[PDB]
């Protein structure tokens, strides 16, 4: 019949943070549904289990938590019907057609500005802070419609809200910083709401103010967008750059056919999912992968692991754009499927990466400053020093 989910008390949060992949290989192999005491959750680690849970909101609710105190209650932590009405108000500025016609040009302007600043910083400098983070910050600033905020504001808001949402230790300074970001955003939105009402434009705020979303939901959804829309594309820029500078075969494929930049982006998010775990809570007794799960159980859907599942892709631990990345779960699959996916892909594959690789000649990793990495709930390079011989634009 149904199996009992084992307790995997050998799984420690510190080890998941430092290197999660060998932990998840063991879990997929021995126990794809497992109770992890330190996490306070059953971790779901197979492709099958994550996918099943993600597509069935009636059984596996998005509405459980720390997210509420950090950010308020956004559409991400609602189920339908309330989710769908908010999501639809959020769609217009992020459709693929609007990204192509309106945003790509703005991204390309921002790539020039930030690549020039990285060039000034000089060979040897960290790419993560030196280019990736301010580029995607200024892009997000434009997408949303924040005329009265700087890219730096956006970077600080993003990290502090994320940190508030994972404040299990209940650090009081962590809560104080997320609260202050929340207040600043509230103030900034007050002024931007007046500005954008009545005023043609293609920013998220412009479309939104033309169903009238209540103010508390505007604030919560904006905070969620900031938390979801900056660190994630920044991380993909780091992963993709590292992967191509680590394999001359992979980089040659791309230079021989630059149409493959899209495939680089899709393979990066399969290989290292930027959002590695998403939470659900069960509403009824259920099962995943033949394991019983009790009503009210809190689950962590480990996308990071699902995208390494050896029954779905051959040699999944390798970065390989020819094998490809068909049906990866990095943007999810149910009714919450990433609204930003087209904006992310354009920023990174269509603009940022080609600009980087065409402007910095002899681009290479630093043999004397090895890249560093961390995270499992969210994962990417913490630092990525690059060197180059000469720089264009």
Ligand X SMILES: C=CC1=C(C)c2cc3[nH]c(cc4nc(cc5[nH]c(cc1n2)c(C)c5C=C)C(C)=C4CCC(=O)O)c(CCC(=O)O)c3C
Q: Are strands 298-301 and 41-44 parallel, antiparallel or unpaired?
A: parallel
Q: Which residue is nearest to Fe ion (CB)?
A: 338
Euclidean distance between CA atoms 54 and 72, whole angstroms: 22
Q: Sort 224 into a burial class: Cβ within 10 Å, 0-12 / 13-18 / 19+.
A: buried
Judged by beta carbon distances under 5 to 8 A according to partner kind, the member of ligand X, Fe ion, none in contact with residue 217 is: none
Q: What angle do CA 64, 70, 74 make, to 5 degrees?
A: 55
> Binder to ligand X among 143, 192, 237, 299 (CB under 6 A)?
143
Per-residue x/- track, 207-236, Fe ion (CB under 5 A): ---------------------x--------
Show the tokens assigned to 215.
């103010």
Buried/exposed code over 291-320 (b: 16+ C-beta within 10 A; e: otherwise) = bebeeebebbbbbbbbbbbeebbeebeebb
Nearest-approach distance from CB 93 to Fe ion, in angstroms: 14
Cβ proximity to ligand X: between 36 and 142 the closer is 142
- The neighbouring-strand residues paired with 382 are none
Task: Rule CB under 6 A: say whether 377 interacts with ligand X.
Answer: no
Binding map of ligand X across residues 121-140, x = CB under 6 A, - = no contact: -------------------x
- Which residue, 93 or 123, is less far from ligand X as judged by CB? 93
**CA 376 – CA 21 distance, rounded (Å):** 9
Options 108-116, 173-181, 340-348, 349-357: segment touching ligand X (CB under 6 A): 340-348
Nearer to ligand X, 28 or 78 (CB): 78
Report 308-347 residues binding Fe ion (CB under 5 A): 338, 340
Determine the distance from the C-alpha atom of residue 81 to the mean position of all C-alpha atoms in its chain, rounded to a whole number: 25
Q: Which residues bind Fe ion (CB under 5 A)?
A: 228, 338, 340
Q: Which residues bind ligand X (CB under 6 A)?
A: 54, 75-76, 87, 90, 140, 143, 225, 228-229, 232-233, 236, 269, 274-275, 278, 330-334, 336-340, 343-344
């Amino acid at each position: 019949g149904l199996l009992e989910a084992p307790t995997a008390d050998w799984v420690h949060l510190a080890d998941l943070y430092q290197n999660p992949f060998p932990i998840f290989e063991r879990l997929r192999s021995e126990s794809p549904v497992a109770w992890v005491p330190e996490a306070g959750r059953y971790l779901i680690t197979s492709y099958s289990g994550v996918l099943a849970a993600d597509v069935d909101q009636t059984t596996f609710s998005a509405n459980e938590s720390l997210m509420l105190r950090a950010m308020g209650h956004s559409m991400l932590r609602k189920d339908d019907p309330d989710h769908q009405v908010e999501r639809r108000a959020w769609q217009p500025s992020l459709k693929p057609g609007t990204v192509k016609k309106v945003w790509k040009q703005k991204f390309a302007e921002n790539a020039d500005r930030y690549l020039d600043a990285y060039i000034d910083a000089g060979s040897g400098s960290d790419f993560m802070q030196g280019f990736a983070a301010p580029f995607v910050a200024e892009n997000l600033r434009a997408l949303i419609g924040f005329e009265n905020a700087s890219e730096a504001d956006l970077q600080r808001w993003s990290q502090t809200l994320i940190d508030g949402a994972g404040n299990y230790p209940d650090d009081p300074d962590v809560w104080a910083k997320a609260k202050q970001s929340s207040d600043e955003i509230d103030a900034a939105l007050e002024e931007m709401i007046q500005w954008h009402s009545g005023r043609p434009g293609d920013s998220l705020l412009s479309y939104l103010l033309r169903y009238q979303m209540p103010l508390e939901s505007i604030r919560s959804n904006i905070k969620m967008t900031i938390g979801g829309g900056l660190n994630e594309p920044r991380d993909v820029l780091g992963v993709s750059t590292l992967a191509l500078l680590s394999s001359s075969k992979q980089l040659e494929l791309v230079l021989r056919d630059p149409k493959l930049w899209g495939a680089v982006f899709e393979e990066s998010i399969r290989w290292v999912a930027p959002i590695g775990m998403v939470p659900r809570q069960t509403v009824v007794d259920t099962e995943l992968d033949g394991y019983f799960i009790p009503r009210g159980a809190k689950l962590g859907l480990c996308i990071l692991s699902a995208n390494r599942d050896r029954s779905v892709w051959s040699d999944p631990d390798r970065f390989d754009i020819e094998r490809g990345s068909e049906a990866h779960l990095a943007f999810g699959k149910g009714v919450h499927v990433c609204l930003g996916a087209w904006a992310a892909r354009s920023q990174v594959a269509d603009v940022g990466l080609p600009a980087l690789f065409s402007r910095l000649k002899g681009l290479r990793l630093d043999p004397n400053q090895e890249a560093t990495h961390g995270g499992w709930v969210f994962r990417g390079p913490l630092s990525l020093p690059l060197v180059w011989d000469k720089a264009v634009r």
